Design an enzyme around this catalytic site. Structure first.
Site, mmCIF file in Angstrom:
data_model
loop_
_atom_site.group_PDB
_atom_site.id
_atom_site.type_symbol
_atom_site.label_atom_id
_atom_site.label_comp_id
_atom_site.label_asym_id
_atom_site.label_seq_id
_atom_site.Cartn_x
_atom_site.Cartn_y
_atom_site.Cartn_z
ATOM 1 N N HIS A 1 0.732 -1.274 0.000
ATOM 2 C CA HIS A 1 0.000 0.000 0.000
ATOM 3 C C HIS A 1 0.733 1.275 0.000
ATOM 4 O O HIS A 1 0.102 2.333 -0.181
ATOM 5 C CB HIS A 1 -0.938 0.013 1.253
ATOM 6 C CG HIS A 1 -2.022 -1.078 1.135
ATOM 7 N ND1 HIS A 1 -2.908 -1.171 0.183
ATOM 8 C CD2 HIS A 1 -2.095 -2.180 1.921
ATOM 9 C CE1 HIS A 1 -3.646 -2.221 0.300
ATOM 10 N NE2 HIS A 1 -3.140 -2.887 1.417
ATOM 11 N N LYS B 1 -4.665 -10.020 -7.451
ATOM 12 C CA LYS B 1 -5.380 -9.349 -6.275
ATOM 13 C C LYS B 1 -6.424 -8.463 -6.887
ATOM 14 O O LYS B 1 -6.048 -7.588 -7.793
ATOM 15 C CB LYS B 1 -4.391 -8.537 -5.441
ATOM 16 C CG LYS B 1 -5.062 -7.866 -4.248
ATOM 17 C CD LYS B 1 -3.975 -7.126 -3.405
ATOM 18 C CE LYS B 1 -4.565 -7.043 -1.975
ATOM 19 N NZ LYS B 1 -4.298 -5.703 -1.390
ATOM 20 N N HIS C 1 -3.438 -2.937 7.914
ATOM 21 C CA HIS C 1 -4.436 -3.222 6.864
ATOM 22 C C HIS C 1 -4.923 -1.924 6.276
ATOM 23 O O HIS C 1 -5.109 -0.934 7.006
ATOM 24 C CB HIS C 1 -5.524 -4.096 7.474
ATOM 25 C CG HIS C 1 -6.835 -4.022 6.833
ATOM 26 N ND1 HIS C 1 -7.179 -4.606 5.652
ATOM 27 C CD2 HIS C 1 -8.028 -3.422 7.398
ATOM 28 C CE1 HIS C 1 -8.472 -4.335 5.450
ATOM 29 N NE2 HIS C 1 -8.977 -3.635 6.528
ATOM 30 N N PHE C 2 -5.241 -1.941 4.983
ATOM 31 C CA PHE C 2 -5.828 -0.723 4.298
ATOM 32 C C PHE C 2 -7.310 -1.019 4.265
ATOM 33 O O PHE C 2 -7.767 -1.955 3.507
ATOM 34 C CB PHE C 2 -5.267 -0.541 2.940
ATOM 35 C CG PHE C 2 -5.651 0.869 2.391
ATOM 36 C CD1 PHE C 2 -4.875 1.973 2.656
ATOM 37 C CD2 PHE C 2 -6.864 0.902 1.700
ATOM 38 C CE1 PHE C 2 -5.324 3.262 2.187
ATOM 39 C CE2 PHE C 2 -7.278 2.110 1.191
ATOM 40 C CZ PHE C 2 -6.532 3.276 1.454
ATOM 41 N N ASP C 3 -8.161 -0.218 4.921
ATOM 42 C CA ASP C 3 -9.605 -0.524 5.007
ATOM 43 C C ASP C 3 -10.389 0.155 3.924
ATOM 44 O O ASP C 3 -11.326 -0.432 3.357
ATOM 45 C CB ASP C 3 -10.172 -0.166 6.426
ATOM 46 C CG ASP C 3 -11.380 -1.021 6.778
ATOM 47 O OD1 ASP C 3 -11.238 -2.281 6.682
ATOM 48 O OD2 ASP C 3 -12.464 -0.393 7.077
#
Length: 124
Positions: A12, A41, A119-121
């Site tokens: 990210h 992905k 984590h990228f939400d």
């Protein structure tokens, strides 16, 4: 094995560019960061900001993550981000993406000590 904090940086962060410079940004980066190695992905965001500024989100506005966990944080400021999503033609191993550049607030989950993104939400 790779830590969730290192994985977050590899999937990210893109401190090396201010924004996507061409429609090919996502095709190039999804491959170079090894996100298309074993499968395409489907969706991935890249954040064009320094890593310290993104890490700092862990001390900004708390909010529950999409999945309900309470360790998510929304950045106070907008950030330069690139949204990458598969194209209709994407087919493993020839993964292909639409690149969408935007200025949005980011939401990330954080863990550990130091407390850093893992984590990228979402981009809001």
């Amino acid at each position: 094995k790779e830590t969730a904090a290192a994985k977050f940086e590899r999937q990210h962060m893109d401190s090396s560019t201010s924004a996507a410079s061409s429609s090919n940004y996502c095709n190039q980066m999804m491959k170079s960061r090894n996100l298309t190695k074993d499968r395409c992905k489907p969706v991935n965001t890249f954040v064009h900001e320094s890593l310290a500024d993104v890490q700092a989100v862990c001390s900004q506005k708390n909010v529950a993550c999409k999945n309900g966990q309470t360790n998510c944080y929304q950045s106070y400021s907008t950030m330069s981000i690139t949204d990458c999503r598969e194209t209709g033609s994407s087919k493993y191993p020839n993964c292909a993406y639409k690149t969408t550049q935007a200025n949005k607030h980011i939401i990330v989950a954080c863990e550990g000590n130091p407390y850093v993104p893992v984590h990228f939400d979402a981009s809001v």
